[PDB]
Amino acid sequence: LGGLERFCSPGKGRGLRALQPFQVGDLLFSCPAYAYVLTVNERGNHCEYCFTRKEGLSKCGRCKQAFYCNVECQKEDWPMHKLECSPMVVFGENWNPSETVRLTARILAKQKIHPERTPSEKLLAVKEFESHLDKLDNEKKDLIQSDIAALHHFYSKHLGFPDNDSLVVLFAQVNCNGFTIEDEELSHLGSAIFPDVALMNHSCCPNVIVTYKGTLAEVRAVQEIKPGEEVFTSYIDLLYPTEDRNDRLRDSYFFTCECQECTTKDKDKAKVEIRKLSDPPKAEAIRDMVRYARNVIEEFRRAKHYKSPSELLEICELSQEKMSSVFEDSNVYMLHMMYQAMGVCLYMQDWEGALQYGQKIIKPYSKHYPLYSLNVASMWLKLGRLYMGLEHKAAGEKALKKAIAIMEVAHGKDHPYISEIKQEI
Numbered sequence: 001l002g003g004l005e006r007f008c009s010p011g012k013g014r015g016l017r018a019l020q021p022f023q024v025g026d027l028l029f030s031c032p033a034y035a036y037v038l039t040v041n042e043r044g045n046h047c048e049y050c051f052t053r054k055e056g057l058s059k060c061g062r063c064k065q066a067f068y069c070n071v072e073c074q075k076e077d078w079p080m081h082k083l084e085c086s087p088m089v090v091f092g093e094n095w096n097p098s099e100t101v102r103l104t105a106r107i108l109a110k111q112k113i114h115p116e117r118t119p120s121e122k123l124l125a126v127k128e129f130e131s132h133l134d135k136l137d138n139e140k141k142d143l144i145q146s147d148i149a150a151l152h153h154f155y156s157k158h159l160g161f162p163d164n165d166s167l168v169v170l171f172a173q174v175n176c177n178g179f180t181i182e183d184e185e186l187s188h189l190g191s192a193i194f195p196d197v198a199l200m201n202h203s204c205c206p207n208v209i210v211t212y213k214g215t216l217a218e219v220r221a222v223q224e225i226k227p228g229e230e231v232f233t234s235y236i237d238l239l240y241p242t243e244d245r246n247d248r249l250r251d252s253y254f255f256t257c258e259c260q261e262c263t264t265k266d267k268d269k270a271k272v273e274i275r276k277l278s279d280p281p282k283a284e285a286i287r288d289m290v291r292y293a294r295n296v297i298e299e300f301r302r303a304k305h306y307k308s309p310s311e312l313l314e315i316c317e318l319s320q321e322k323m324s325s326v327f328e329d330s331n332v333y334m335l336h337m338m339y340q341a342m343g344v345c346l347y348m349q350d351w352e353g354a355l356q357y358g359q360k361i362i363k364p365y366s367k368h369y370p371l372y373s374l375n376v377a378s379m380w381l382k383l384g385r386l387y388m389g390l391e392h393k394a395a396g397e398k399a400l401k402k403a404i405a406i407m408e409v410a411h412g413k414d415h416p417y418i419s420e421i422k423q424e425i
């Protein structure tokens with residue numbers, strides 16, 4: 001952080017710039033989580049305090065519903081875990097606050113136990129977070145109001161609250177500045193507040209990548225960075241075309257990107273790769289597959305919440321066929337559905353079927369994402385593991401080596417994930 005300063009970045013509020021060069025692979029800084037929560041689906045799998053995965057975790061009393069490496073991990077998490085420990089017992093299987101509520105409760109607790117600046121806020125304090133309150137529409141205000149109600153409903157056994165206005169602000173700050181923590185395969189592990197990391201502005205051709213070591217955020221260069229240069233990470237999945245990207249950035253972060261990628265649109269045609277038929281369709285035919293895909297995308301997002309695995313894959317398939325009258329297999333709308341289908345296959349434990357989709361995804365992914373991408377790395381890593389599971393030792397090795405080559409840059413050469421992967425080789 002000494003090699004960096006915050007500054008007033010025009011048209012972007014505040015951001016972070018470098019004073020000294022950074023080579024590809026260099027650590028810029030790391031940031032302990034100010035507040036963090038492990039996602040409910042990983043209970044019993046990972047230590048709630050440190051996120052380490054173990055078979056054989058120590059359980060809490062009592063809730064019997066939280067798990068830890070050992071007595072120290074448990075002791076360390078108690079001030080946060082107490083917010084839910086006794087209230088889970090009472091609510092039982094009626095206990096169900098969103099992850100956003102769970103994290104906010106933790107923020108409020110941390111503000112009370114530790115009001116002064118933390119080591120997580122060297123350049124930017126939580127209380128300084130941009131909220132865009134002034135830009136929020138009634139729709140978004142509503143949603144927040146709802147989270148507030150749930151907060152009170154589940155958490156007042158052991159935490160008091162500020163007034164309603166102060167909380168709307170905090171919720172919007174959380175939406176503008178919160179992070180997910182994902183594993184080496186980009187599975188969701190949880191959600192967290194990394195204030196100094198949240199100083200960084202977005203770009204679609206980012207020069208750094210944020211990765212996690214348990215609950216420690218680390219920030220590394222994926223392009224050479226000049227003195228005078230703004231450090232930009234990416235806030236989003238970079239697979240999608242410029243328009244889709246910007247709908248998301250406006251909707252979640254209330255800005256339109258104008259990075260180099262977002263200005264030239266050079267990657268757009270290839271991401272919307274067109275088939276070479278002997279009667280290429282009209283544009284509007286394309287629209288009616290694109291609008292249909294973008295709509296199928298949004299629609300697939302909900303059935304996730306409640307359809308069966310047999311029934312989820314069934315949907316992925318028909319949508320793919322229909323699209324494949326106009327789109328190449330390298331078209332991202334095809335990739336998005338192949339990815340979702342893969343995830344189903346991996347959940348259904350269809351490993352051969354998982355591998356089939358992964359094999360069609362990886363080359364196009366390599367085209368469309370930038371040179372160093374966690375999405376590309378995690379795909380090669382899933383292919384590698386799938387291959388090794390089928391004792392394709394050669395193909396498995398090749399793919400795991402490809403994941404490593406990216407990860408050494410993004411995660412660092414000494415990251416515990418690299419160690420594990422090299423043991424798998």
Ligand SMILES: CCN(C(=O)CO)[C@H]1CN(/C(=N/C#N)Nc2cccc(OC(F)F)c2)N=C1c1ccc(Cl)cc1
Binds near residue numbers: 181201235
């Ligand atoms: C895909 C890249 N991101 C990651 O977090 C990857 O680790 C996005 C995604 N993003 C959020 N997604 C969700 N959900 N953050 C987030 C948004 C709302 C609430 C939240 O925590 C919840 F528990 F409160 C967390 N928040 C991100 C993000 C946020 C800030 C910066 Cl500087 C960079 C990225």
Ligand SMILES: C[S@@+](CC[C@H](N)C(=O)[O-])C[C@H]1O[C@@H](n2cnc3c(N)ncnc32)[C@H](O)[C@@H]1O
Binds near residue numbers: 011013130177200
């Ligand atoms: C986590 S913050 C980054 C710190 C931010 N600059 C601020 O003012 O606090 C997320 C917000 O920063 C701003 N931001 C980040 N990257 C940007 C960019 N390329 N263009 C415009 N604004 C950006 C937006 O106001 C965005 O919603």
Ligand SMILES: [Zn+2]
Binds near residue numbers: 047051052070
């Ligand atoms: Zn632990």
Ligand SMILES: [Zn+2]
Binds near residue numbers: 060062063064065086
């Ligand atoms: Zn407990």
Ligand SMILES: [Zn+2]
Binds near residue numbers: 204259260261263
């Ligand atoms: Zn951009």
